[PDB]
Coordinates of C-alpha atoms and ligand atoms in Angstrom, one line a residue:
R1 CA 10.9 -14.6 8.2
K2 CA 7.5 -13.8 9.7
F3 CA 8.4 -10.2 10.5
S4 CA 9.8 -9.6 7.0
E5 CA 6.7 -11.1 5.3
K6 CA 4.5 -8.8 7.5
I7 CA 6.4 -5.6 6.8
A8 CA 6.5 -6.5 3.0
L9 CA 2.7 -7.0 2.8
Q10 CA 2.0 -3.7 4.7
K11 CA 4.2 -1.8 2.2
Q12 CA 2.3 -3.4 -0.7
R13 CA -1.0 -2.4 0.9
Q14 CA 0.2 1.1 1.4
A15 CA 1.4 1.3 -2.2
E16 CA -2.1 0.2 -3.4
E17 CA -3.7 2.8 -1.1
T18 CA -1.4 5.5 -2.6
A19 CA -2.3 4.2 -6.1
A20 CA -6.0 4.5 -5.3
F21 CA -5.6 7.9 -3.7
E22 CA -3.7 9.3 -6.7
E23 CA -6.5 8.0 -8.9
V24 CA -9.1 9.9 -6.9
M25 CA -7.1 13.2 -6.9
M26 CA -6.7 12.9 -10.7
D27 CA -10.5 12.7 -10.9
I28 CA -10.7 16.0 -8.9
Ligands
ZN101 ZN1 -3.0 -6.3 -2.3
ZN102 ZN1 2.8 8.4 -6.5
ZN103 ZN1 -10.9 7.3 -11.7

C-alpha cells in the first residue's frame, strides 16, 4: 500500500511538471 501510494504521487508530480514545462515552451 505504501509503495503504491508513493509511486502514484511521484507520477502525478511528474505529470504536473510536464504540464508546467509544456506551458513554458508554448510561451517560447
Ligand atoms: Zn500535486
Ligand atoms: Zn504532453
Ligand atoms: Zn504561460
